[PDB]
Structures are given as C-alpha cells and as structure tokens.
C-alpha cells in the first residue's frame, strides 16, 4: 500500500530477514555446551530477535523490497491509515519535553537575574531552586500561551543591543 | 438548669440556644449551625415529620386492621405492595393528579416561607383569610378544632417529639422490610416471641 | 482558610476570594490576573460540562441495572444511537459544532468585553439578558429560579457547591474512562466487583496501570 | 394590573401598570428595556392575534367535518388536491407558496412600517370596521391578550396530543370526556419518562 511498501507481516524479505538472522545465531549456539552462559546468552538473542521481528509487523511496519520497516511522515497519510506511532506522535512527544527543558531553563535564568552575583549561579547552579522549577515546566505550554497573549515572553526591540549595520 | 439535653451531663451546641421547639441541643454534625439554614432545615423538620406521621399511621393501621381481619382485601395487601394492588386508575395517573394537586398547596406555603405571612388569603374568595401564624403553623382553617389556644408551647413540643420518632419510625419499618422483608407487625411478632435471638444482630448473623 | 494539604504555603495571587480558593497553584500557573480570570472560567465551564455528564453516565446505568430504564454504556451509547437515530456522524457534529460555537463565541466576546452582549439592537430582543454578572456567572437568563439573589452569603455557599462538585465530577469522568480503559467494564461494574473483594481488586490488580515486567 | 402571577410577590416593577395584560410575569427580566418592551409587547399581541386564528381554524375544520388541521397539509407531497369548504380550487404547492409570500410581505412590511409603534399593536380605522373601540377599549384588550395567551397555549396543546397522542384534538377530548381517569397526558406514553 502507501508507496509500493508491502506490509511487514505479508513481507517475504522480512520473513527471509528473520530465518536466515536466527540461523546465524543458531549456528554460534551450536559451538557452546548447552548450559554454559555463552549459551543461555545467545538463545537470549534469539529470543529477543523473534520477538522484535514481530513486534514490528504486529505494529504493521510497512517495508520495501529490502525488507526493512519504512516509517510515513505525511500526517494525513500516517492518520488516515492507521501509522500514527510512527513519527506522527512520536514528534509531539519530544517537542512537549524540548518546551519543557527550555522553559524550566529560561525560568531559572530570569530568577538568578536580579538576584546578587547572576554569574556564580550559572556556574555553581542553585540544585534547590532549580529542583523546585524543574516541574514548573509540566504545564509549559500553558504558561508560554499565557506570556504571549500578554506580551512578555519576547523584549521590546529597544532594549536589545544590536551590530552596527 | 436548662433544657432537655439529648444526652444528660453534654454541653449544649452555641447555635441551639432553645429558642426552637424540641430545641435539646443535639447538633452533632454542625448541619444546622448557620441560622438562615436552621431556619429552613427547622420547617423541612416539621414537613419532613408531619408527612412521616401520616406515613407511619398508613402502613401500622392498614397491617393492624389486616391483622385483627377488619381491614378488607385491601387491608390485606402489605403496605410494601399496595403499589402493584389495582384500584380504578394505573398508578401514573393517580402520581400526575397528587402532583398538579401538590404544587398549589407546595407553592402557597412556600409563599409563606420566603415572605413570611403572605399567602393567608383565599384567591376565590376575599373574605376568606387565615390568621397570623408563625411560619410553619398555619392555625385558622388549618385548625378547625380551634386548639391553638389551650397550651400551644407544649403543644408544639408534643409534636417535634411525636414528629421525631414517626421519622425514625418510618426508617425502621423501610430498614425491617429491607432485611427481613416481610410488613413492621410481622417483625414485631417475630421478636415478642424469642426476643432475645431475633435482634438485629442474630438476624444478620443468619442471612 | 482550608487549604489543599494543611502546612503549604498559599501562592500570593491566590487570596480567599474564587470560589473553592484552597490556595493549589504549585506550579504558578494563574500567576497573571488575565490568566487567572480566563482560567476560572474554564474550571467552570469544565466542571459545569463534566457534572452534567458524570450525571448522564451514572444515573442512566444504575437505573439500567435497577431494571428502569435500558440505556447503553457510556462506551457503547454512541453507535447505539447512531444506529438508532440514523443521523451520520458528520452531519450530526458539524451542527453541533455550529451551535456550539456560536453561545461560545457570545460567552468568548463578554469575557474579552464584560457585559458587551448587551449591547443596544444586537440580539433582537434579549441583549439586556445577555449582560452577566461575575466572570462564569451569567446571572439572568442563567439561573431563572434566582437562587443567586437570596443572600450575599447563600451565592457563596451555592457557589463552592458548583466547585467543589465540579472539581470532583471532572475527576470522576477521568476515572470512568480510565476504569474502562484499563477494567473493560461500566463505572457500576468496576465498583460491584472492588466491594466483593476489596483487597484484591484495585488498580494494581488490572494488568495495565502498572506494566509489571521484573 | 390584571392580577399577580404569584399572589404575595412584587418583583416585576419595570411592566408598566396600565400595559395590557400586565399580570406581573417576568422571571428571566426580559422587559426591562424599555425598546425590548415595545417590542415584545408587539410580538405577543401579533403571536396571541395569529394563534387565535389559527386555533379557530385547527377546530373548526374538524368542527364542520372536513378534516383534521395535520391532514391539511398532505394533499400537496401525495400531489392530490386542495380543497376549502369541500369546494375544490385549483392550485398547487409553489404557486401557494408563492401567493402567500407576496401576499405576506406587502401586508406585513406595512404594518412594521408603521413608526407610531401604538398602531404597529392598535392600528384600528380600516382595521376597526364596526369601531367596538369607541369606549372599554382598555379592558377588551385584556380580553384580546387573554384569550390570545390561551390561544397560543391551546395551539401547542393540539401539537403536543397530535405528537404524543396521535389523534386528533376534538377526538382526544372526547377520548378523556369518555375515559378520563384512563386516558390522560400521564397515559399518553410520552408526557412521562421513556
Ligand atoms: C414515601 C412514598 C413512597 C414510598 C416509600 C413507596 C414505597 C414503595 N412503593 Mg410506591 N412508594 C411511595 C410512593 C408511590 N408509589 C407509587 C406507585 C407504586 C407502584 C406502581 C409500585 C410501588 C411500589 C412500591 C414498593 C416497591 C418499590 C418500588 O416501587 O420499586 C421500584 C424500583 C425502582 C424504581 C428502582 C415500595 C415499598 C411497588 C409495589 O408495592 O409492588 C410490590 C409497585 O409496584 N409504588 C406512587 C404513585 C401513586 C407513589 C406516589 O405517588
Ligand atoms: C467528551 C466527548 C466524547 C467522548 C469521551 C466519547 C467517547 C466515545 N465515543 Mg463518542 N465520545 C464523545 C463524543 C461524541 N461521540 C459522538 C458520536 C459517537 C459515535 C457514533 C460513536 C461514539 C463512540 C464512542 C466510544 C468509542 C470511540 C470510537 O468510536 O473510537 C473508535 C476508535 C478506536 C476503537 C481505536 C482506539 C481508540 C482509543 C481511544 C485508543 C467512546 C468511549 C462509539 C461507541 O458507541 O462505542 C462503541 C460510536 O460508535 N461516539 C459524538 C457526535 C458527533 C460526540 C460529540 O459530539
Ligand atoms: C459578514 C461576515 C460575518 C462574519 C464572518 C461573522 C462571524 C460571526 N458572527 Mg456575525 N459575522 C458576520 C456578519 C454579521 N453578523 C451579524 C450578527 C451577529 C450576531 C447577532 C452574532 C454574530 C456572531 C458571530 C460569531 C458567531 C460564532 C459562531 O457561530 O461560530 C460557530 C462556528 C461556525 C458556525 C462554523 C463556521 C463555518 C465556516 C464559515 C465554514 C467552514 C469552515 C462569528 C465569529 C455571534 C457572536 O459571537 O457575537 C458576539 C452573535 O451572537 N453575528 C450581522 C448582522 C448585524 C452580520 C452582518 O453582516
Ligand atoms: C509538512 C508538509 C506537508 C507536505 C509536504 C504534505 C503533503 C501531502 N499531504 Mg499533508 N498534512 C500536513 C503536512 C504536509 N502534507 C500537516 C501538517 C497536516 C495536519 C493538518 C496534514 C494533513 C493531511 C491530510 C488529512 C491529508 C494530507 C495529504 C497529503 C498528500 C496529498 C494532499 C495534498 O494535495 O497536499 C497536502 C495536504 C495537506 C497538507 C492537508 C490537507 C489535506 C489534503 C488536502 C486532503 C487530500 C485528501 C486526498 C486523499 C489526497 C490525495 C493524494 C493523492 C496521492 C491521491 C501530500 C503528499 C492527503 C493524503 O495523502 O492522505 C491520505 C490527506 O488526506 N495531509
Ligand atoms: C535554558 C537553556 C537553553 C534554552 C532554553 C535554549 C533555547 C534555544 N537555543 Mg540554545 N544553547 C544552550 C541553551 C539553551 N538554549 C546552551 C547551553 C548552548 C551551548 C551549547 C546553546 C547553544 C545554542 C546554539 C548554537 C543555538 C541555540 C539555539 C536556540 C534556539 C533554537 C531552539 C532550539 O532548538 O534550541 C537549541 C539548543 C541547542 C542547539 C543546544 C542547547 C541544548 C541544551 C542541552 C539545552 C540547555 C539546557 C540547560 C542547561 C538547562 C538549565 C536548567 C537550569 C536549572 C540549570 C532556542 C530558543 C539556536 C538559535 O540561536 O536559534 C536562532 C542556535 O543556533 N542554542
Ligand atoms: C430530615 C429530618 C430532620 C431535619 C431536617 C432536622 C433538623 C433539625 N433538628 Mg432534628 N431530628 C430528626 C430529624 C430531623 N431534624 C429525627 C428523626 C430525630 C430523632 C432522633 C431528631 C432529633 C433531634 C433533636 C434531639 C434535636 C434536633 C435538632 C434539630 C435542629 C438543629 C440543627 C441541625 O441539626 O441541623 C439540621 C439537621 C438536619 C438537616 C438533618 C438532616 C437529615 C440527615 C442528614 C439524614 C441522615 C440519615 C439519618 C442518620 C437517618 C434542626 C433544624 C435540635 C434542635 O434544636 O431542635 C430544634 C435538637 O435538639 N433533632
Ligand atoms: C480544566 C480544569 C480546571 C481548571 C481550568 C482549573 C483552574 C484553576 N484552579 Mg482547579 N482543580 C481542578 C480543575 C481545574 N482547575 C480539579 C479537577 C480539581 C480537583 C483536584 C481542582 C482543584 C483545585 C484546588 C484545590 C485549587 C484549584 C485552584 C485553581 C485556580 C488556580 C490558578 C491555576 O492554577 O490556574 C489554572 C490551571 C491550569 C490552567 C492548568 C490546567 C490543568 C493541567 C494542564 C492538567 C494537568 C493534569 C492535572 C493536574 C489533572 C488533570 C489530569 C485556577 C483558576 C486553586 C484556587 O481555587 O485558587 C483560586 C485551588 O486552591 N483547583
Ligand atoms: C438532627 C441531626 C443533627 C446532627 O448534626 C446530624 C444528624 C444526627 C445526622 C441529624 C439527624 C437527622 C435525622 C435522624 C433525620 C431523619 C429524618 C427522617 C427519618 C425523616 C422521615 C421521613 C418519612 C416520611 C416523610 C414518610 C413518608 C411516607 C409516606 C408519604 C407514605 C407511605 C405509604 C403508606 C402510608 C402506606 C401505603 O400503602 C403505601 C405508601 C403510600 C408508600
Ligand atoms: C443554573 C440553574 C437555574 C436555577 O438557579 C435552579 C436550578 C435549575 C437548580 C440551576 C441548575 C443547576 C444545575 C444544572 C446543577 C447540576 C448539578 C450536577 C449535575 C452536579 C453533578 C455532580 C457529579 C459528580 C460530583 C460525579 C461524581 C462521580 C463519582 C464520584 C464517580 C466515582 C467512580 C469512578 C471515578 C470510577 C468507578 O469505576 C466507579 C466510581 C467509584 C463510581
Ligand atoms: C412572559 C415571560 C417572562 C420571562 O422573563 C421569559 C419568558 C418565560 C420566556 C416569557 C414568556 C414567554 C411566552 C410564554 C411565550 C409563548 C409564546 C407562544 C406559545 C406562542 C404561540 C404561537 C402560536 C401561533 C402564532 C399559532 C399559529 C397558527 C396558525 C397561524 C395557523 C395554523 C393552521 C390552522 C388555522 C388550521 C390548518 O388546517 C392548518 C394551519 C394553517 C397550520
Ligand atoms: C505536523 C508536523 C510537521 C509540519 C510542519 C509544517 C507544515 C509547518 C511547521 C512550522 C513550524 C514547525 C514551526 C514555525 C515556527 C515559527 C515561530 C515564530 C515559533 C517559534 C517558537 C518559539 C519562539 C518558542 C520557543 C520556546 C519558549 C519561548 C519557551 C520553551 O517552550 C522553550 C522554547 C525554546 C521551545 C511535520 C514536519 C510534518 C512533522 C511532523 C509534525
């Protein structure tokens, strides 16, 4: 479907990917006793290979030709069929906790601003009031909203230094 | 050197000062601590209870009479089942009529709660009027017999009293019936029989 | 004044004044007086929403399953009455979504203006009742029966009823959603089975609260 | 004032007491502008004035015996034919349609014409033919509001048994006049829950 992907679970490279990757560590185990740790170890791995290769096409990875899982960005595309854990919510994901590191961060910076020497608390960092901001950043985007339909996340244009032209 | 204390040698609640009939000092739960609450909670005991003496008088002489064979059929029918017994209407007809009938004597009085004397006036008739009453005591028609003379303090006292255990009375036969299922005179036999292994308590114990 | 947990330090901004004020705003979020009055509204609204929807998933099922009515679960109701009703799905949000916005947007406009519904000529004849009184009190049209004019003291008691009902019905939805999420079963259903054996069926017992792998 | 909505309240202050039909009824306080006044005055007089008619004609077709006010409007979707008195006319859905809308909107773009805004309610002349409003004009207007309030009442009574009931007004009233104690709103399966 999609782009000539073919679905992981009716991909035959995918199953070939999967007998021939097993069989490759069915070959190491053979070289070991059957109690030693190098084995419980290797058959660890054959477990766990058996399980990922499943894991992936029960998630309905499509793949090309290679056999190889491919991931879809198009929202639309990802949304309308069902390939939304791929990439889709993954993406907002990290942008809730990338706001949140920057807005704890900023949060901390503009304390120490004011307070005594700023400087020697950007090198020795204050651990208890930066342990009492870290989650002040949960409801981030809230805040941030709050701070632009207020006019205060941003300066006035003539307060910031500028290069001569 | 006070009033009846609900348990004797206890302090008596601020609020409760004895002002209100059957006032023996027994707020516990602090329900009625704002006054402007204890004075609707005070007229919703005196509803509460009127219609609870009533209650408890319709189900206790319908049995008696069933019991002593007096009562007819319908007497015979347990109070916990007169709803199902036919009569001349179905039972939605006779709730929608007592509805229409209760909202005009509901909102004449609640007249009278809201504007203190305000609703002693026949509409029809001019000339007919109720006389001036303490919110909650109506008098005039309301008391044909004419007893609001000969001693209405105690009275009123012997109504809280009678109105207060009716309530707790009508809670028991709902409690008896929950459990033991069966009507309040059949319970009361069942204990003056072997009282002293049909309480509560052994009953339970066997369900 | 009670406070949200006894021994923590009241914020600032948060002086007894807002119905329900407990003094919770851990992480300064109603900071900004503009934030702080939008974000009472919303509490308002969201409890006000979620209430007469707590009532419209518990009331309807334990009447279903004391024999008086048939209502479908919460999580079942809507394909019931799609199939029942016939309208389309579509066709039956978008018009809902029309009227909706349009009292969201009158509610919206006499936040950004107070009592700027009024206005002279605007909905033929009831602008005066769309003035308000308060931030999330239209008092008027709103509260007919004028429950709200008794006493100065009765609003305030009527008024940490709504919150405090509120607060608790929002976190009863999220329950309801979560119990079935994890349960499978009706809000009744969950709690029928807890009272059989309530030290073995928590949500620790369910298998999807806490992925127990180790 | 006509009397008290609620014997023993005084709440409504801003309805003028010489207004027709002041009984003293304003819950939600919609009469308080004094524009808002006018016109709702206006829209009930002209609501209670079309109701009147119309609950007239919703009976007294079945009165005559020609059929029921709901089946009037039926020939025209099975394509059958229209027919007043039992005398038939020879017409059809848009050119009714039509007809109305004119004749609708020439007649009613005049009266809202009107600035005086007592004649947009009292026109009278032309409109008072046998001129009963030479004296007691003050007190047959209570009549006019009245019966027209009860009116539109009686307009949504027809409705609400046409829906619930089914059967026709005069039929249902016979049904209650034979059955009372059987047949009623709480019976009608609708009135009350599910
Ligand atoms: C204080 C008032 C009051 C009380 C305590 C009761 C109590 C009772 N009514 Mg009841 N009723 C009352 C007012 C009224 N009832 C009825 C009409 C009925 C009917 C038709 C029936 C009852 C029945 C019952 C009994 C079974 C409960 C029930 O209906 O389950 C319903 C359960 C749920 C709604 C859940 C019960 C002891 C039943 C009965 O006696 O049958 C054995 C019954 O069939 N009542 C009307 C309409 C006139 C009432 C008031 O207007
Ligand atoms: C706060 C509002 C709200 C909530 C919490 C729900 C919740 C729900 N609705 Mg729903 N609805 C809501 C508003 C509305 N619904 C509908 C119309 C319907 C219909 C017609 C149906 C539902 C159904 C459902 C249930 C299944 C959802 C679904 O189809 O997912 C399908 C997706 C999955 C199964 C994938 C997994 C999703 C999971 C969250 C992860 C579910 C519990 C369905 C139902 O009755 O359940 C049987 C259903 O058929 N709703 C309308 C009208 C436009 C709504 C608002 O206007
Ligand atoms: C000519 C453009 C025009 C536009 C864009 C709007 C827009 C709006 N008017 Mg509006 N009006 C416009 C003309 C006029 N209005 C009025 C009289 C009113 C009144 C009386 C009111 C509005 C209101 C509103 C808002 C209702 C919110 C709503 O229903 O959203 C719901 C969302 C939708 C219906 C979806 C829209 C779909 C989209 C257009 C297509 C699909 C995408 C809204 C933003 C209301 C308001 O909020 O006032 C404060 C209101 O009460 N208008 C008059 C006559 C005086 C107009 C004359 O031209
Ligand atoms: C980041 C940039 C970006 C790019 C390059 C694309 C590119 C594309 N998107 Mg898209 N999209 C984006 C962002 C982007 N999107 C974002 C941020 C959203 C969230 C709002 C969406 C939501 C979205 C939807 C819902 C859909 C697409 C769809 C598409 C494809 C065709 C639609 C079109 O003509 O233009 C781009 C269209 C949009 C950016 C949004 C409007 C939705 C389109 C116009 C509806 C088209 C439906 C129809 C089936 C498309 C025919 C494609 C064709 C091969 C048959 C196209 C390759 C369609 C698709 O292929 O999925 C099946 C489609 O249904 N996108
Ligand atoms: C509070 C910390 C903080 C914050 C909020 C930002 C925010 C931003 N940076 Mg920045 N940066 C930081 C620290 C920070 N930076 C540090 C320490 C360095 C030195 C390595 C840089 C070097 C840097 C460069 C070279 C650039 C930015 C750029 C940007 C902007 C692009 C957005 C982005 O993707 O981030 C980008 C962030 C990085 C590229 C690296 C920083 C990532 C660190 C890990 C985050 C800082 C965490 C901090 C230590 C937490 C303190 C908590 C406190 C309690 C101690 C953005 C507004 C870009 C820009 O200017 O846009 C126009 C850009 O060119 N940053
Ligand atoms: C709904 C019935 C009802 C109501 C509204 C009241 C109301 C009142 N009672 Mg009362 N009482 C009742 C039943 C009721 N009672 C019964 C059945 C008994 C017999 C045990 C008593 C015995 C009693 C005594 C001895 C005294 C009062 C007193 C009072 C007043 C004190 C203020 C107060 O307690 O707050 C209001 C209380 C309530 C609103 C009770 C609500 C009903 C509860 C919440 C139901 C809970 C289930 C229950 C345990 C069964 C008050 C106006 C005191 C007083 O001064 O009298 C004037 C006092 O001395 N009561
Ligand atoms: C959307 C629902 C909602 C909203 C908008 C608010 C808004 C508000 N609450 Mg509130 N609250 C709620 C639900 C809500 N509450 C619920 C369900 C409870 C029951 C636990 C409480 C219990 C509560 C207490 C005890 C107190 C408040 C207080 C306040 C005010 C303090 C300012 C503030 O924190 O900004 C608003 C906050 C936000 C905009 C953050 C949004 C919520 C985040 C994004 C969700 C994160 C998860 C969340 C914690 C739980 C949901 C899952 C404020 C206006 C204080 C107060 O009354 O001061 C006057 C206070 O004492 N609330
Ligand atoms: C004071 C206090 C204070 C502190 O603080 C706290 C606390 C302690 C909590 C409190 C207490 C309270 C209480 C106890 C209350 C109670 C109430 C009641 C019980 C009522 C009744 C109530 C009851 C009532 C009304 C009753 C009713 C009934 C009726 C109508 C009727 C019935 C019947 C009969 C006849 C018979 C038939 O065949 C059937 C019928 C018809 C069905
Ligand atoms: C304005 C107006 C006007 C004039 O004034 C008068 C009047 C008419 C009166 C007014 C009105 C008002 C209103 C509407 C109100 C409403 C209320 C509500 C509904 C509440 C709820 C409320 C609700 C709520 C709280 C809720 C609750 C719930 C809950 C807890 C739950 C719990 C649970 C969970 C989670 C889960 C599980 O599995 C189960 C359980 C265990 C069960
Ligand atoms: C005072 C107050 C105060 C506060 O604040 C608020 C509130 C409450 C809102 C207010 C109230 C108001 C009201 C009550 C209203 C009502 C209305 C109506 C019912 C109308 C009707 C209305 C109704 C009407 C017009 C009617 C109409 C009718 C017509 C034209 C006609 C019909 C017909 C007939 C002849 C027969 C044929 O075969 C068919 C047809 C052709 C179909
Ligand atoms: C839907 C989505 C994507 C779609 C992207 C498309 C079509 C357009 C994207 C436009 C984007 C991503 C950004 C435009 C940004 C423009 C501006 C002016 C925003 C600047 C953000 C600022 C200034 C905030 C900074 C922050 C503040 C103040 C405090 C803390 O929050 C920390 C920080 C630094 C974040 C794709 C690529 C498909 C992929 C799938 C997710």
Redesign the pocket.
């Known amino acids: 479907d999609i782009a000539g992907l073919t679905p992981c679970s009716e991909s035959a490279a995918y199953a070939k990917r999967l007998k021939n990757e097993v069989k490759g560590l069915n070959k190491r185990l053979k070289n070991y006793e059957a109690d030693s740790a190098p084995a419980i170890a290797l058959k660890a791995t054959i477990e766990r290979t058996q399980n990922r290769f499943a894991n992936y096409a029960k998630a309905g990875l499509l793949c090309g030709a290679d056999g190889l899982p491919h991931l879809i960005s198009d929202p639309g595309l990802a949304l309308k069929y069902g390939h939304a854990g791929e990439v889709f919510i993954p993406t907002f994901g990290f942008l809730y906790v990338?706001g949140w590191?920057?807005?704890?961060?900023?949060l901390?910076?503009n304390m120490v601003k004011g307070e005594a020497k700023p400087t020697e608390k950007e090198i020795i960092?204050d651990v208890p009031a930066?342990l009492r901001?870290?989650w002040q950043g949960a409801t981030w985007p809230v805040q941030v909203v709050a701070e632009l339909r207020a006019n205060t996340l941003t300066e006035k244009a003539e307060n910031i230094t500028i290069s001569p032209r | 050197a006070n009033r009846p204390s609900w348990f004797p040698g206890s302090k008596f609640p601020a609020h409760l000062d004895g002002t209100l009939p059957g006032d023996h000092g027994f707020d516990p739960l602090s329900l009625g601590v704002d006054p402007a609450k204890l004075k609707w909670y005070q007229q919703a005991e005196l509803q509460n209870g009127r219609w609870a003496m009533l209650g408890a008088a319709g189900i206790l002489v319908p049995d008696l009479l069933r019991a002593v064979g007096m009562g007819g059929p319908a007497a015979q029918v347990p109070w916990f089942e007169a709803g199902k017994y036919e009569y001349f209407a179905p039972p939605s007809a006779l709730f929608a009529s007592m509805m229409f009938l209760f909202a005009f004597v509901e909102f004449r009085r609640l007249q009278d709660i809201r504007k203190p004397g305000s609703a002693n006036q026949d509409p029809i008739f001019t000339n007919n009027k109720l006389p001036a009453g303490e919110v909650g005591y109506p008098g005039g028609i309301f008391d044909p017999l004419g007893y609001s003379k000969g001693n209405m303090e105690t009275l009123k006292l012997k109504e809280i009293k009678n109105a207060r255990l009716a309530m707790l009375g009508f809670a028991g036969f709902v409690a008896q019936y929950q459990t033991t299922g069966k009507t309040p005179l059949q319970n009361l036999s069942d204990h003056l029989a072997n009282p002293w292994s049909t309480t509560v308590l052994s009953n339970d114990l066997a369900r | 004044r009670p406070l949200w947990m006894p021994g923590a330090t009241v914020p600032a901004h948060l002086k007894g004044e807002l119905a329900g004020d407990f003094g919770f705003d851990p992480l300064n979020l109603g900071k900004d007086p503009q934030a702080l009055r939008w974000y009472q509204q919303a509490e308002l609204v969201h409890g006000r929403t979620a209430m007469t929807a707590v009532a419209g998933i518990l009331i309807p099922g334990l009447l279903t399953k004391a024999g008086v009515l048939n209502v479908p679960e919460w999580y079942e109701a809507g394909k019931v009455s799609a199939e029942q009703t016939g309208i389309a799905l579509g066709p039956l949000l978008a018009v809902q979504l029309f009227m909706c916005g349009f009292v969201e947007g009158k509610r919206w406009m006499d936040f950004l203006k107070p009592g700027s519904q009024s206005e002279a000529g605007s909905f033929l004849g009831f602008e005066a009742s769309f003035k308000g009184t308060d931030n999330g009190y239209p008092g008027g049209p709103f509260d007919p029966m004028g429950m709200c004019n008794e006493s100065e003291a009765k609003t305030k008691d009527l008024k940490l009823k709504e919150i405090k009902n509120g607060r608790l019905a929002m976190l009863a939805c999220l329950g309801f959603a979560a119990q079935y999420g994890a349960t499978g079963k009706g809000p009744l259903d969950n709690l029928a089975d807890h009272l059989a054996a309530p030290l073995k069926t928590t949500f620790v017992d369910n298998g999807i609260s806490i992925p127990i792998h180790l | 004032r006509a009397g008290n909505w609620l014997p023993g309240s005084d709440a409504p202050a801003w309805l003028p007491d010489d207004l027709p039909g002041n009984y003293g009824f304003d819950p939600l306080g919609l009469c308080k502008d004094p524009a808002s006044l006018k016109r709702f005055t206006e829209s009930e007089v002209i609501h209670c004035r079309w109701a009147m008619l119309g609950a007239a004609g919703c009976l007294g077709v079945e009165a005559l015996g020609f059929g029921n006010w709901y089946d009037a409007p039926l020939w025209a979707i099975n394509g059958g034919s229209p027919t007043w008195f039992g005398i038939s006319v020879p017409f059809d859905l848009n050119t009714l349609l039509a007809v109305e809308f004119v004749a609708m909107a020439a007649a009613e773009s005049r009266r809202g014409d009107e600035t005086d805004a007592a004649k947009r309610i009292y026109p009278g002349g032309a409109f008072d033919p046998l001129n009963f409003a030479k004296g007691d004009i003050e007190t047959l207007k209570l009549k006019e509001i009245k019966n027209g309030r009860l009116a539109m009442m009686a307009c949504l009574g027809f409705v609400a048994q046409h829906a619930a009931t089914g059967k026709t007004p005069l039929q249902a009233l016979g049904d209650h006049i034979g059955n009372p104690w059987g047949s009623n709103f709480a019976t009608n399966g609708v009135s009350l829950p599910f």
């Open positions: 990338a590191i920057g807005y704890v961060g900023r901390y910076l960092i930066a901001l870290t």
